[PDB]
Amino acid sequence: PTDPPVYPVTVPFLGHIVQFGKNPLEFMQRCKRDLKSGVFTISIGGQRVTIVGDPHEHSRFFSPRNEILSPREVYTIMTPVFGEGVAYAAPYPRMREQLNFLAEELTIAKFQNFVPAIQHEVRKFMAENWKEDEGVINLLEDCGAMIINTACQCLFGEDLRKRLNARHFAQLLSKMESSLIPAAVFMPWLLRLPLPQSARCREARAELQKILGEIIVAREKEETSDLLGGLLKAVYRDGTRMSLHEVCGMIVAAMFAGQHTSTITTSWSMLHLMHPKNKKWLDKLHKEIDEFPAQLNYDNVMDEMPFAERCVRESIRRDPPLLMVMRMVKAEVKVGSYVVPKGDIIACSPLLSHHDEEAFPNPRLWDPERDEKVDGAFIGFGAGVHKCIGQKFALLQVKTILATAFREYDFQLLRDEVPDPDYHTMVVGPTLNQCLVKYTRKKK
Numbered sequence: 001p002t003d004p005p006v007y008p009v010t011v012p013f014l015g016h017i018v019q020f021g022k023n024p025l026e027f028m029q030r031c032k033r034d035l036k037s038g039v040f041t042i043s044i045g046g047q048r049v050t051i052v053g054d055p056h057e058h059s060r061f062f063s064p065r066n067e068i069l070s071p072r073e074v075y076t077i078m079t080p081v082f083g084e085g086v087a088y089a090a091p092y093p094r095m096r097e098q099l100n101f102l103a104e105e106l107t108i109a110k111f112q113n114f115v116p117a118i119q120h121e122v123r124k125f126m127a128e129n130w131k132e133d134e135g136v137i138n139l140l141e142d143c144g145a146m147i148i149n150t151a152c153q154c155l156f157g158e159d160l161r162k163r164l165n166a167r168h169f170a171q172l173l174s175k176m177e178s179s180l181i182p183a184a185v186f187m188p189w190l191l192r193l194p195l196p197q198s199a200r201c202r203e204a205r206a207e208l209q210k211i212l213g214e215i216i217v218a219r220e221k222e223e224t225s226d227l228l229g230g231l232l233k234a235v236y237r238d239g240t241r242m243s244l245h246e247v248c249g250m251i252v253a254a255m256f257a258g259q260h261t262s263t264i265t266t267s268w269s270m271l272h273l274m275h276p277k278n279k280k281w282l283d284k285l286h287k288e289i290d291e292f293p294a295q296l297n298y299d300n301v302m303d304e305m306p307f308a309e310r311c312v313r314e315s316i317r318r319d320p321p322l323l324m325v326m327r328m329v330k331a332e333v334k335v336g337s338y339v340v341p342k343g344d345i346i347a348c349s350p351l352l353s354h355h356d357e358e359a360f361p362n363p364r365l366w367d368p369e370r371d372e373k374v375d376g377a378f379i380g381f382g383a384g385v386h387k388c389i390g391q392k393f394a395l396l397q398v399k400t401i402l403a404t405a406f407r408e409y410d411f412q413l414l415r416d417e418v419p420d421p422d423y424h425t426m427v428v429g430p431t432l433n434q435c436l437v438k439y440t441r442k443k444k
């Protein structure tokens with residue numbers, strides 16, 4: 001029968017913009033607690049948003065098919081970045097084929113030379129930028145630079161990187177990104193407001209696609225196995241080749257998806273590990289990595305870093321970079337004793353569910369040894385058919401960075417406490433001006 005309870009609204013135009021914008025973690029716990037329901041509804045500018053904040057009900061968000069809970073309508077703001085006809089904007093079966101092709105480029109089959117590529121690039125960075133015996137750095141910025149540099153070294157052949165270096169790629173992604181209005185997911189009318197300067201999303205994507213076109217022409221001329229080369233062998237079930245427009249789009253998706261999420265996960269991980277109270281965990285990290293050779297390989301990172309993986313997964317559990325995942329409800333869904341109606345946005349919140357007292361007791365505590373106490377409660381990388389395809393690659397990057405950085409340097413946070421999360425950006429990370437750290441090169 002029953003609609004989920006709606007948190008009381010006192011200003012109709014805005015709904016709960018003020019309280020949700022200011023502090024999503026507090027506000028979502030408040031609704032859940034005061035409405036006495038894991039499943040509840042808020043308003044963003046009048047759009048109903050129904051949140052499935054009971055982890056026992058996660059599968060009611062993650063299992064229904066696309067024609068019932070449809071991501072397309074929520075992510076139409078990405079069309080200028082990924083492209084028309086690409087990903088979400090393609091018919092559902094074709095979307096799935098395209099994403100599957102990109103997932104195959106990021107599985108363990110492709111990783112055998114990634115660890116040394118990552119390591120070589122990290123060391124280049126540290127040698128260029130962490131030069132003296134000690135120095136002060138912004139860690140969130142530097143981790144960001146290492147994430148883009150490493151991913152490019154892994155995924156793009158040398159011919160590509162001669163036309164399109166990591167800094168130039170970074171600039172292209174920044175222009176695509178800065179054009180986006182995250183709230184237009186809930187309030188599409190925001191696209192009608194004037195901008196402070198012209199957007200450059202369409203020009204930046206056109207330039208990327210033109211570079212890739214030119215690289216392809218050249219490769220074809222000289223007579224194969226980077227990301228670009230793999231996507232060029234993609235053939236759909238209808239017997240047609242993935243187009244240049246689509247290949248470009250999957251490449252943007254891949255770089256775009258990782259750039260803030262992996263950076264932030266790296267940064268948080270290092271921020272907890274270096275905090276004085278977490279000395280026991282840093283010691284345990286050293287036990288695990290202190291017997292490694294200078295030149296790490298696939299086995300060391302994939303098989304011999306379980307504790308460091310737990311550090312990374314717990315940093316995501318505590319402070320998930322993506323606070324919510326969303327679907328447009330095309331046909332009503334039953335969730336527990338409620339029915340979520342057609343036209344709602346339905347969402348599952350890693351932020352909310354990771355603070356559930358049953359699933360994660362003392363959830364503001366960073367405890368790499370914890371396990372979820374409700375199965376499937378951790379949803380940092382989603383679940384079901386839309387689960388993260390970049391998750392293995394991302395974890396390979398982060399763990400390689402950690403093993404390399406903490407081998408050569410000690411770190412000290414220049415404030416008393418790990419940063420507050422800054423909930424003001426669409427991908428959520430530690431507050432930037434709080435991420436000053438002092439490195440000290442270890443006696444070798």
Ligand SMILES: O=C(N[C@H](Cc1c[nH]c2ccccc12)C(=O)Nc1ccncc1)c1ccc(N2CCN(c3ccc(C(F)(F)F)cc3)CC2)cc1F
Nearest residue numbers: 016017020021044075182183185253256257258261426427
């Ligand atoms: O970051 C995002 N999208 C990119 C791009 C991307 C999207 N689909 C993908 C699928 C695969 C790969 C990349 C992507 C991405 O990189 N996503 C990604 C996806 C999977 N893996 C890695 C990365 C993204 C993040 C958040 C987001 N909102 C969050 C909260 N909102 C909101 C609005 C108003 C209020 C207030 F009014 F104040 F109340 C409060 C909150 C608005 C929406 C929207 C986002 F689009």
Ligand code: HEM
Nearest residue numbers: 254257258261262265325380381382386387388389390394
């Ligand atoms: C720590 C880093 C990352 C985090 C925390 C993260 C998180 C997530 C989450 C929560 C989802 C579920 C989205 C939904 O259900 O709507 C997801 C899906 C996805 N992620 Fe990531 N991700 C990360 C890194 C990456 C990387 C490096 C890629 C590179 C390709 C990527 C690509 C994707 C894609 C394509 C999906 C789509 C699944 C779909 O709709 O089929 N992610 N990710």
Ligand SMILES: [Cl-]
Nearest residue numbers: 079080083084
């Ligand atoms: Cl386009």
